[PDB]
Design a protein around this motif. Structure first.
Motif, mmCIF file in Angstrom:
data_model
loop_
_atom_site.group_PDB
_atom_site.id
_atom_site.type_symbol
_atom_site.label_atom_id
_atom_site.label_comp_id
_atom_site.label_asym_id
_atom_site.label_seq_id
_atom_site.Cartn_x
_atom_site.Cartn_y
_atom_site.Cartn_z
ATOM 1 N N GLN A 63 63.570 1.829 30.316
ATOM 2 C CA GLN A 63 62.574 2.689 29.686
ATOM 3 C C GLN A 63 63.046 3.322 28.374
ATOM 4 O OE1 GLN A 63 61.628 6.225 31.830
ATOM 5 N NE2 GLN A 63 59.972 6.809 30.429
ATOM 6 N N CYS A 99 56.741 2.202 40.819
ATOM 7 C CA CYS A 99 55.329 2.307 40.445
ATOM 8 C C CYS A 99 54.884 3.736 40.131
ATOM 9 C CB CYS A 99 54.421 1.682 41.507
ATOM 10 S SG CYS A 99 54.017 -0.054 41.196
ATOM 11 N N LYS A 102 55.816 6.198 35.629
ATOM 12 C CA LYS A 102 54.760 5.744 34.721
ATOM 13 C C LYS A 102 55.263 5.270 33.359
ATOM 14 C CE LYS A 102 50.207 7.072 35.906
ATOM 15 N NZ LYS A 102 50.198 7.291 37.387
ATOM 16 N N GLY A 103 56.194 6.022 32.775
ATOM 17 C CA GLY A 103 56.746 5.707 31.455
ATOM 18 C C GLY A 103 57.547 4.424 31.445
ATOM 19 N N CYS A 104 58.340 4.225 32.495
ATOM 20 C CA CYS A 104 59.074 2.977 32.688
ATOM 21 C C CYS A 104 58.111 1.821 32.932
ATOM 22 C CB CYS A 104 60.072 3.100 33.841
ATOM 23 S SG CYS A 104 61.133 1.653 34.025
ATOM 24 N N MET A 105 57.032 2.095 33.666
ATOM 25 C CA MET A 105 55.966 1.117 33.891
ATOM 26 C C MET A 105 55.309 0.682 32.580
ATOM 27 S SD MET A 105 55.844 0.117 36.987
ATOM 28 C CE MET A 105 54.257 -0.716 37.020
ATOM 29 N N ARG A 106 54.937 1.656 31.752
ATOM 30 C CA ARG A 106 54.344 1.381 30.445
ATOM 31 C C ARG A 106 55.286 0.533 29.595
ATOM 32 N NH1 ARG A 106 53.817 7.144 30.821
ATOM 33 N NH2 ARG A 106 51.835 7.633 31.860
ATOM 34 N N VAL A 109 55.311 -3.177 31.052
ATOM 35 C CA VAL A 109 54.095 -3.859 30.596
ATOM 36 C C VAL A 109 54.201 -4.227 29.109
ATOM 37 C CG1 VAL A 109 51.573 -3.628 30.291
ATOM 38 C CG2 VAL A 109 52.654 -2.725 32.351
ATOM 39 N N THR A 141 48.391 2.930 39.513
ATOM 40 C CA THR A 141 49.313 2.970 38.375
ATOM 41 C C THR A 141 49.372 1.624 37.661
ATOM 42 O OG1 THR A 141 50.709 4.749 39.275
ATOM 43 C CG2 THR A 141 51.699 3.323 37.611
ATOM 44 N N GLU A 144 46.160 1.608 35.709
ATOM 45 C CA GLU A 144 46.172 2.602 34.627
ATOM 46 C C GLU A 144 47.048 2.182 33.436
ATOM 47 O OE1 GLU A 144 43.891 5.776 36.942
ATOM 48 O OE2 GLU A 144 44.198 5.396 34.803
ATOM 49 N N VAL A 145 48.148 1.480 33.711
ATOM 50 C CA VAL A 145 49.055 1.005 32.647
ATOM 51 C C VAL A 145 48.572 -0.276 31.948
ATOM 52 C CG1 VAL A 145 51.161 2.150 33.488
ATOM 53 C CG2 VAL A 145 50.604 -0.169 34.295
ATOM 54 N N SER A 147 48.221 -3.537 33.426
ATOM 55 C CA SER A 147 49.025 -4.691 33.839
ATOM 56 C C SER A 147 48.221 -5.987 33.788
ATOM 57 C CB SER A 147 49.569 -4.495 35.259
ATOM 58 O OG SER A 147 50.225 -3.248 35.403
#
Length: 309
Positions: A63, A99, A102-106, A109, A141, A144-145, A147
């Motif tokens: 991230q 999951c 969120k920031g690491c998820m964004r 992606v 999540t 929302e991101v 994916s």
């Protein structure tokens, strides 16, 4: 020793966090994560990795690097994602945890746009496991991101089979989650022809997961005549009928659900299926051992027998 490396990851992250510049080459960052990535393949090392918060440390480093820069930079993300892959496989806990970051998820992606397709194979493998048997929080999540949109867009530009394999598998899981997701797939230009394109993939996993995506989204295509025409010019129903004869029970199950959607609420595909032999081809499958094959077979047949022409 496992403890020793995870602190070095934090230490470097702290230094990057103290700037929010440092470059990753200065603090042995890739060799640090490479050993951790290598050791993440063993089951016994994984129980220690979870309990020292290794999953949390590796994710945040992925991230931070993304937030900073957007070879060394790329290769840390590789191993980090490779480790995350090993750390999410069959671990229900680590799935909701990652999951929720969120920031690491964004950031994850976002990596589906990178110059390294090898990294794209790695990320989509993280997204595969995350989407597979996801909990009700996780599905949100992932949605929302964005994916679905990114993975479907990633599918159209990738060359390698191993990469696409993981992209399509994530999208097979992600489509089944909600109709909002299904809409994101159908909304992408040139996506529906590619999904029909995967039904006749030369070099079966691709045909399964791709016909899996199409199967899920066909509930929105059945209402959509303009999207039915993209299936028509790419001769999709003809291919679907050939699938009914397939060795793979997953493909036959796919075709049935896809056909059951398409065989309804449209005169042209109904009549086409009659002219191709959909009556006899779906009838030989109604006494099948398997639910989904027995489900779709007569279900699509009932839509057809009620609409003779």
């Amino acid at each position: 020793h496992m403890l020793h490396l995870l602190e070095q990851i934090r230490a470097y992250c702290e230094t990057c966090w103290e700037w929010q510049m440092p470059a990753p080459v200065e603090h042995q960052i890739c060799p640090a994560v490479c050993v951790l990535m290598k050791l993440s393949f063993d089951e016994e090392h994984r129980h220690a990795m979870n309990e020292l918060g290794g999953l949390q440390a590796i994710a945040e480093l992925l991230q931070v690097d993304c937030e900073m820069y957007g070879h060394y930079s790329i290769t840390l993300r590789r191993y980090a994602g490779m480790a995350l892959t090993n750390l999410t496989f069959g671990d229900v806990a680590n799935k909701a945890t990652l999951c929720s970051m969120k920031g690491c998820m964004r950031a994850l992606v976002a990596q589906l746009k990178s110059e390294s397709e090898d990294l794209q194979q790695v990320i989509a493998s993280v997204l595969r496991n995350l989407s597979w048997r996801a909990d009700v929080n996780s599905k949100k999540t992932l949605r929302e991101v964005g994916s679905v949109k990114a993975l479907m867009e990633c599918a159209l530009e990738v060359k390698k089979e191993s990469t696409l394999k993981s992209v399509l598998s994530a999208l097979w899981n992600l489509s089944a989650h909600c109709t909002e997701n299904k809409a994101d797939i159908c909304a992408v230009d040139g996506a529906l022809a590619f999904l029909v394109g995967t039904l006749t993939y030369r070099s079966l996993a691709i045909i399964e997961s791709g016909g899996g995506i199409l199967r899920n989204v066909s509930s929105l295509i059945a209402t959509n005549e303009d999207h039915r025409q993209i299936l028509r010019e790419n001769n999709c129903l003809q291919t679907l009928l050939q699938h009914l004869k397939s060795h793979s029970l997953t493909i036959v199950s796919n075709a049935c659900g896809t056909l059951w959607n398409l065989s309804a609420r449209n005169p042209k595909d109904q009549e086409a299926l009659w002219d191709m032999g959909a009556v006899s081809m779906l009838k030989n499958l109604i006494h099948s051992k398997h639910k989904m094959i027995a489900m779709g077979s007569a279900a699509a047949l009932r839509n057809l027998m009620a609409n003779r022409p």
